[PDB]
Structure formats: structure tokens, C-alpha cells
Design a protein around this ligand. Structure first.
Ligand code: UBD
Ligand code: UBD
Ligand code: CA
Length: 358
RNA sequence: UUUU
């Protein structure tokens, strides 16, 4: 059996999606070490009201003050599993809640949401059921790995630029000022752990959050969070249209899931400077394509995701942390399944399994 | 997460 992905098959009413609640958080430091606190959280600090406009040099510091995370290290769900293990007897939802949930990274769910419209990059998701709970962990495809290794110099610099933008927009303390004189270390990360539910599928997932805005209408997370992004400066209605049809879909999916209400974009010129900023409220993104014949639809995204979770749940019958049902998908085809045991696909570590078993 |  397989699962189809065409939008037409999921054009029904918007499904139930529980307002996300933050269960906790964790941080990864400069050395990629886990800390069960919010030390890595930064604060939204845009340009001063009276000062000149933005003119952030996103290339400054590249590559001398750049400390990139080692992409060869496949952490999978390890950090999230540590959080779950250290909070297993403090989870809300009542007894047996975790056993009926699906645990994964927000980014994995984002890829599910965009599947009906994605035409360039496919994916693979490893699934294992353990003590009722369904765990989903992405597997880098052979092709994605090859593309990563063949990454052009230009792309490598563009990747730095995205992280550098965050440095110009965030401060270490509330109401503080940004300090671009530092180094860009991508090992550092602040992750929010959230609870939600899509249809009849309870969810426990985590995702990196860029910063907390002290000026946010609602100060309670995740409503107080802000997502930062950079994108090429646009001048023609045609360019904006393409942006609404492809980029906003991804921005929407990513922030809608964790309940992050605003995405702030820095538009960069060909020289690598951000000379303008624009705030995109997550709940207003769809408005840009609501009457677009070539637009995307949140209901299609969510209904497909719900269908995938149902498909995964019914497919993974065996409760075994050493067993993996691999769900593979490439544009133009359905989601297919293959079964595997232990290495290399098995992803639940012994330190997690043994503790949960005992 | 970053990004084309
Ligand atoms: O974007 C897509 C495109 C196709 N499919 C599916 O791939 C199978 C063959 O379709 P086709 O390439 O048109 O010959 C069909 O499902 P099937 O194996 O017959 O249930 C299509 O629905 C899909 O799920 N998403
Ligand atoms: O629901 C929970 C479960 C555990 N803990 C705690 O998390 C730490 C790691 O426990 P563990 O890996 O599961 O053996 C221990 O405290 P510690 O930091 O070693 O004093 C547990 O008591 C906790 O606060 N809530
Ligand atoms: Ca971001």
C-alpha cells in the first residue's frame, strides 16, 4: 500500500488543529552540548525608531568568524528524546498521553505539509513505534546527501548570510542591542517543545525558535516568538507572485505548526546587504494566494498531513524500537513504504529505550 | 535551523 499526494485529494474543510502549548524548551551551546534551559534564547531587537534604516552586511565575517555545525553528525531525534526522557513523568494530557502521541521534529511535519505542492525535493521518514508512541525521524536521501556534498561556494555563502541576519536582529538580553562583532556559530540553538493535535493525532514536537519579542501582543509562548528570514529583494509584481506561491508556503507551514505568529523578513540586494524589512503575520500569509489559480491552500497541507499520520499509524503495527518502516517520497509519485531492522535505519538509542523500558 |  501507498499514499497519494495530489492536492485535489485533500481539498476538504480545514481539519482540527489544537492551539499549540509550549511544554518546555532546551538549548544547544557553541559546542553542541544540550542544556535543559533557555540559555540560547535571544531577543528580537530591530533597528532603532529614530536611527537610519537597515543596511546589514550579511557577508561580514564570512568565512573567518564562521563556525558551522558538523553536518556529517546525524543527531536525528536524540536531543528531543533527552527532553522527553527528562520530562516523561511531568507531561500533561493525563496517563498514557505519550503512548497515544506521535513524536517528531517540527521540520519533519513541515515537509509533510508542503508535500502536495513540492515539485523539486523528496524526502524519507523513518518510523518506529515504541510503547505505543509513534516516532518519526527524517533520513537524508542519497540524492540530498550528494547535493549537500556538491554544494556550490555561492550557496555556502548564502547559508552563512541567513544566520548572519539573525545576529543583526537579536540581542542577548530583552531590550538589549545586537552585536554583529561576534562569530556565527551554528551549533547554538534554542528549541521550543510543544504539544498539539491534528485531527485525532496527538503531537509532541520541537523546533528551533529565533527569538522572543518583548513587544509581542501576547507575552506567553509561543505567541511571543518571532521567526526571522532573508529573501531576495523583489521589484516586480511577477516576482512577488512567485514569492507568495512558493516561499510563503514554506514560511507559513514552518511557523503555523508551533504557533509562531510573525515572520520578519530581511530583503537582501545583490551585494549582500539587507536594506529593508517586512513583517508577515503567519495567519495572513494565505491571503496572498487565496484567489490564485496557482496558489497553495492550508487545508490541503493539513489534510494531507493528517492522512499521512493515519497512514503511518495503520502501517506501523509492530511495537518494536529496532524496527523501522521507511516512508519514501519523490515529487510526481505516491509515498511508498519499506521495512528495515537495526542499523542503519533504527534511530531510537539504547539510552532512551532502556530507560523507558525500566 | 540556514539557503538556492
Ligand atoms: O504528485 C503525485 C503524482 C502521482 N501520484 C500517484 O502515483 C501513482 C502513479 O501516478 P502517475 O505518475 O500519474 O502515473 C498514482 O497513485 P497509485 O499508485 O495509482 O495509487 C498517482 O496518484 C501521487 O500520489 N502524487
Ligand atoms: O519526569 C521526569 C523524569 C526525570 N526527571 C529527572 O531528569 C534527570 C534525568 O533522569 P533520567 O535520564 O530519566 O534517569 C533526573 O534528575 P537529575 O538531573 O539527575 O537530578 C531525573 O530525576 C525529571 O526531572 N522529570
Ligand atoms: Ca529563521
Amino acid at each position: 500500500p501507498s499514499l497519494r499526494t495530489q492536492p485535489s485529494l485533500y481539498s476538504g474543510p480545514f481539519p482540527f488543529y489544537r492551539r499549540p502549548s509550549e511544554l518546555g524548551c532546551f538549548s544547544l551551546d557553541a559546542q553542541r552540548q544540550y542544556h535543559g534551559d533557555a540559555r540560547a534564547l535571544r531577543y528580537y531587537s530591530p533597528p532603532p525608531i529614530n536611527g537610519p534604516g537597515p543596511d546589514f552586511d550579511l557577508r561580514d565575517g564570512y568565512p573567518d568568524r564562521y563556525q558551522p555545525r558538523d553536518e556529517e553528525v546525524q543527531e536525528r531525534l536524540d536531543h528531543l528524546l533527552r527532553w522527553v526522557l527528562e520530562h516523561r513523568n511531568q507531561l500533561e494530557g493525563g496517563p498514557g498521553w505519550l503512548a497515544g502521541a506521535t513524536v517528531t521534529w517540527r521540520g519533519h511535519l513541515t515537509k509533510l505539509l508542503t508535500t502536495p505542492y513540492e515539485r523539486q525535493e523528496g524526502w524519507q521518514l523513518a518510523a518506529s513505534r515504541f510503547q505505543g508512541t509513534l516516532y518519526l525521524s527524517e533520513v537524508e536521501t542519497p540524492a540530498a546527501r550528494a547535493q549537500r556534498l556538491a554544494r556550490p561556494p555561492l550557496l555556502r555563502e548564502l547559508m552563512y548570510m541567513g544566520y548572519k541576519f539573525e545576529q543583526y536582529m537579536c540581542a542577548d538580553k530583552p531590550g538589549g542591542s545586537p552585536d554583529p562583532s561576534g562569530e556565527v556559530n551554528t551549533n547554538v540553538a534554542y528549541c521550543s517543545v510543544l504539544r498539539s493535535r491534528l485531527g485525532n493525532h496527538p503531537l509532541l514536537f520541537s523546533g528551533e525558535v529565533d527569538c522572543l519579542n518583548p513587544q509581542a501582543p501576547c507575552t506567553q509562548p509561543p505567541s511571543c516568538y518571532v521567526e526571522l528570514k532573508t529573501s531576495k529583494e523583489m521589484h516586480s509584481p511577477g516576482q512577488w507572485r512567485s514569492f507568495y506561491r512558493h516561499k510563503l508556503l514554506k514560511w507559513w507551514a514552518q511557523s503555523f505548526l508551533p504557533g509562531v505568529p510573525h515572520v520578519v523578513a530581511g530583503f537582501r540586494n545583490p551585494e549582500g546587504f539587507v536594506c529593508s524589512l517586512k513583517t508577515f503575520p503567519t495567519m495572513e500569509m494565505f491571503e496572498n494566494v487565496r484567489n490564485d489559480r496557482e496558489g497553495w491552500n492550508p487545508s490541503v497541507c493539513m489534510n494531507f498531513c493528517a492522512a499521512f499520520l493515519s497512514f503511518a499509524q495503520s502501517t506501523v503495527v509492530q511495537d518494536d524500537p529496532r524496527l523501522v518502516h521507511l516512508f519514501s517520497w519523490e515529487p510526481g509519485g505516491p509515498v511508498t513504504v519499506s521495512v528495515h531492522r537495526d542499523a542503519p535505519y533504527a534511530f531510537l538509542p539504547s539510552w532512551y529505550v532502556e530507560t523507558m523500558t525500566q
